[PDB]
Amino acid sequence: MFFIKDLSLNITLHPSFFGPRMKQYLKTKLLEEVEGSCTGKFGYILCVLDYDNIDIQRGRILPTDGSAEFNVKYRAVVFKPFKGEVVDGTVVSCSQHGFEVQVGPMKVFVTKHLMPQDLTFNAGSNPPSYQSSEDVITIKSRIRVKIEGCISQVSSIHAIGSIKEDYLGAI
Amino acid sequence: RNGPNEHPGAKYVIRDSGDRIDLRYSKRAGDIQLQYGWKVERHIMDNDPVLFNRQPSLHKMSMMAHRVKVIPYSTFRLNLSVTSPYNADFDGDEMNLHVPQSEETRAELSQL
């Protein structure tokens, strides 16, 4: 599921910083920029590998001011929740709406209408969960969950999960 | 500190992110310290390259860049040898003056 793509970034540098350290300045700019990003097209950017031959091209100077625009070339590991993909995670939160999963850095929700009516909200047990037959599921337990689709392309990225599928739950 | 009253003065002071300051209504001049990166709208001083134009503008010689010299009378004064390219006389002619607003335009007007 993990992919590495040759992404591109455009940055603007003030001419007051036009010193011999422009290369390292752009390096740290990119480093703090793409780390932890939540872009809706590529997905989740986790690590920026290949910290060599970044190949910072010449910076075209805008006619308006002295700033220069740079087009840096880099590769990084991406993370996108492709719809219809089976993934395995851990339970973190479980309200009456459903039990969430911790597949990667996301908050995929398994809403009550997705999995069958077998799962019941039993609040008597100390950890609030959906204790039922066909194996035991609880908080911080192994669970395999499918992805129905992608929502909220802007801001945070997450999806919705379902368990109603043969050889998908329990495990 | 001179203010917008004498010729060698300023009219506006621009701080970061706009926020224009007026030097004729605020009167707070003198007790204001100019930090680096600000902009000051000073008056047009001597040796300032400006664009001097006469209409109709047929050829490129109708547009010229001159050097500002402040004079104590309310009229435009020019050398007698530049009237021929302008095709202008002094029987009541009217001519326009344009000033640059950036280093790019000032330098390109001076050098071109």
């Binding site: 599921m1 993990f2 992919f3 590495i4 793509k5 040759d6 992404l7 591109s8 970034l9 455009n10 480093l31 703090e32 780390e35 932890g36 872009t39 097209k41 590529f42 989740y44 986790l46 690590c47 920026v48 590998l49 290949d50 910290y51 190949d55 070339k73 590991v77 993370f79 996108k80 492709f82 719809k83 219809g84 993909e85 089976v86 395995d88 995670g89 851990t90 911790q102 597949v103 990667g104 850095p105 395999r144 689709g149 992608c150 599928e165 043969d166 050889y167 495990i171 | -």
Partner: protein, 180 residues
């Protein structure tokens, strides 16, 4: 921020062929035969759960070593693993780096292969088939017991692989994941 220029009338295509699907139909950005920065006609790289963890770990230690050498020139099991990448992340990436902790924890908890030789030979074993690297990554990461689990897990392998070969390399992967 993009890597592919407009083509096939991207301005007003007006097709809207959904957004994603389980039976291939990958996104436009993640399409086969990607364009490399200097090269061209390079297929998309797919990483398994174990491969991605090794990649990020090796990148992190390389960056830490580079930073340490720059400073010098200027001048158990799962429990032990958590301390290692904790102390690696606490000084290499810097910043908030809140999102990185969860990804690394999930990679360590759900890691299938922990031996360099085994993960290296995984690609050699899987290169026999001409399957799309995404589904081979899915079968390498997700566990299985026989052909039924692999067939039911994803809908992209309908009659694309012979059952005998499918069960053969499924048992091969089963032993290659149970040996470590």
């Amino acid at each position: 921020s993009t890597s592919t220029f407009q083509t096939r009338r991207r301005r007003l295509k007006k097709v809207e062929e959904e957004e994603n699907a389980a039976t291939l139909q990958l996104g436009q950005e993640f399409q086969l035969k990607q364009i490399n920065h200097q090269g061209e006609e390079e297929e998309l790289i797919a990483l398994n759960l174990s491969e991605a963890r090794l990649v990020i770990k090796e990148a992190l230690v390389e960056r830490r070593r580079a930073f340490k050498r720059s400073q010098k020139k200027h001048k158990e099991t799962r429990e032990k693993e958590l301390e290692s990448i904790d102390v690696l992340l606490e000084q290499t990436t810097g910043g908030n780096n809140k999102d990185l902790k969860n990804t690394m924890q999930y990679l360590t908890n759900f890691s299938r292969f922990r031996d360099q030789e085994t993960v290296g030979a995984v690609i050699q074993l899987l290169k026999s088939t001409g399957l799309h690297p995404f589904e081979v990554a899915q079968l390498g990461s997700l566990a299985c017991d026989t052909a039924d689990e692999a067939k039911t897990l994803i809908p992209s392998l309908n009659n694309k692989i012979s059952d005998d070969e499918l069960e053969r390399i499924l048992k091969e992967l089963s032993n290659l994941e149970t040996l470590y």
